[PDB]
Design a protein around this ligand. Structure first.
Ligand SMILES: *[C@@H]1O[C@H](CO)[C@@H](O[C@@H]2O[C@H](CO)[C@@H](O[C@@H]3O[C@H](CO)[C@@H](O)[C@H](O)[C@@H]3O)[C@H](O)[C@H]2NC(C)=O)[C@H](O)[C@H]1NC(C)=O
Ligand SMILES: *[C@@H]1O[C@H](CO)[C@@H](O[C@@H]2O[C@H](CO)[C@@H](O[C@@H]3O[C@H](CO)[C@@H](O)[C@H](O)[C@@H]3O)[C@H](O)[C@H]2NC(C)=O)[C@H](O)[C@H]1NC(C)=O
Ligand SMILES: *[C@@H]1O[C@H](CO[C@@H]2O[C@@H](C)[C@@H](O)[C@@H](O)[C@@H]2O)[C@@H](O)[C@H](O)[C@H]1NC(C)=O
Ligand SMILES: *[C@@H]1O[C@H](CO)[C@@H](O)[C@H](O)[C@H]1NC(C)=O
Ligand SMILES: [Ca+2]
Ligand SMILES: [Ca+2]
Lengths: 271, 268
């Protein structure tokens, strides 16, 4: 009368141990109450099941390509002069986790309500954790679903779903969320200007899609290479250069950043 | 004695008289400007600034580089006249008068940016690449860039300073073209009864044009329920319903004027 446990991943080869009682002593394996082997004779038809015999008294049960259906107690009854000896083995077949459905990469507008979904299998059933890959760690409470109400431009990026069950390495998939928003002028600063020399105005801006920059002065649009000015537009900024800053140039300049979702303005005088 | 007065300012060359009936006289190198209250110069900029009676200072308005040189004030006295020679030095803030215009070049070409400026003293010209990852460049009118890479594009700043007033600063936009590169291609969950997606992120200047091929067969935006969304930096293939007929190796292609490139990915 003995008991033992054994845990094996799905697919592995299990070897349930059993020892015979010297010569003229045979063994027999049971599956709950179904006979698998008795001595050298096989009762099971499962080709995965065999007897692994290394020593003359080794009567271990060898199950190949184990599956979750094999879970349960296996009993080895050993013949003897007196009451047979019973060695019982509880087989538990575990399955690594695997995500089988996750929200696909998306593009949404700022302020909308988003819900990410992640579903995974595994034995034991896995715990599903969400995580936002950003300098702000912000570990999110567990759950298959991550609700994001009023999504901000700062909440964009890759989101990581992690399904763990302590069996093996957890499965990890990602989702790319792009948040579109109307442009925002973060800064507008002009440089010093010697009278006869040139003047510069930076206009830093953000926006998804990237914003198109325009420059104005009193409702009149300024153009590159016309009237003695130079507008150089970059991905995140635009620079207005006034060649010769005479007294007839002072005034309020206005930078404009617009995309598909909206616009924005910012004014500044020329020093 | 020396004095520095940048162009346009009003210069006041100081010369104080001795007590009693002592008159002064100002010279320009060796040309007489004033003698007492009488003016020899015709320059209307030149006058005598007098606070108290002993003040015989010379007031030059709107100074120019032509006024550079020594000025001498001779004041009569009981013995040899007393002199107060002052060397006037007129300085000029720097001014860029020619700078390379915004340009577009291919990757690997040899580029030379130019920036020329005047100023008194002659200004030092500094080139600077406005980029998070960049190394400053030696001063000089010319910035040589051999084998320009896509990472060397962006905003270049010429700054000409001579410590007089504020420095002049102009900029140049350099665009570097290069053949497109597919940085990533990723598919989501493959499951009948759900939507399938394949994103294809790519870079390229000019921006690349995206094409999709299913097992060497081109795909169209409305061919058997599929949807192709082409953006500036990525293309997304959306299979409405993932039937068994859509399984296979999908191929994203990104091409521009300078070249092309592809990247494949299977579904299950
Ligand atoms: C130990 O005993 C258990 C329980 O009797 C055996 O599990 C039985 O295992 C087989 C094969 O793993 C299962 O069969 C299958 O049926 C499903 C449909 O239900 C089919 O999709 C599969 O292809 C396969 O034909 C069977 O359901 C399962 N019985 C129970 C009650 O769960 C196990 O095989 C035994 N181990 C041995 C003999 O080594
Ligand atoms: C002090 O003396 C010097 C010379 O001893 C004077 O420089 C002279 O300055 C005048 C104007 O200030 C110059 O004349 C101009 O010439 C330009 C062309 O160069 C012309 O476009 C103008 O219309 C004007 O005619 C003159 O050339 C220059 N001579 C020299 C030798 O430098 C200076 O003006 C005197 N400053 C005083 C008295 O405050
Ligand atoms: C680009 O320049 C190559 C040589 O650059 C040379 O190396 C630099 C560092 C300087 O020392 C310069 O004086 C040298 O001449 C040429 O071999 C190459 O042909 C040039 N490319 C083109 C398109 O002309
Ligand atoms: C998002 O959720 C808020 C409450 O958190 C609700 O007021 C709003 O109507 C929701 N928006 C959508 C589009 O469901
Ligand atoms: Ca030129
Ligand atoms: Ca050179």
């Amino acid at each position: 009368a003995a008991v033992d446990n054994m845990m094996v991943r799905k697919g592995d080869t299990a070897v349930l141990r059993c020892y015979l009682e010297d010569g003229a002593s045979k063994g027999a394996w049971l599956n709950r109450s179904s006979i698998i082997f008795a001595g050298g004779d096989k009762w099971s038809v499962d080709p995965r099941v065999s007897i692994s015999t290394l020593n003359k008294r080794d009567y271990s049960l060898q199950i190949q390509n184990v599956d979750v259906t094999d879970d349960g107690p296996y009993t080895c009854s050993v013949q003897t002069q007196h009451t047979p000896r019973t060695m019982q083995v509880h087989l538990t077949v575990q399955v690594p986790p695997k995500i089988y459905d996750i929200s696909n990469d998306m593009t949404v507008n700022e302020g909308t309500n988003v819900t990410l979904t992640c579903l995974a299998t595994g034995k034991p059933e896995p715990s599903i954790s969400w995580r936002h890959i950003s300098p702000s760690a912000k570990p999110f409470e567990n759950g298959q679903y991550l609700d994001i109400y009023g999504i901000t431009r700062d909440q964009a990026g890759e989101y990581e779903c992690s399904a763990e069950n302590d069996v093996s390495f957890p499965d990890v998939r990602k989702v790319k969320v792009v948040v579109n928003f109307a442009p925002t002028i973060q800064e507008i600063k002009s440089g010093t200007v010697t009278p006869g020399r040139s003047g510069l105005i930076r206009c830093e801006g953000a926006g998804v899609p990237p914003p198109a920059f325009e420059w104005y002065k009193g409702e009149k649009k300024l153009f590159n290479g016309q009237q003695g000015i130079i507008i150089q537009n970059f991905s995140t900024r635009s620079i207005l250069t006034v060649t010769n800053v005479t007294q007839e140039h002072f005034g309020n300049y206005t930078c404009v950043a617009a995309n598909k979702l909206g616009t924005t303005n910012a004014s500044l005088p020329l020093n």
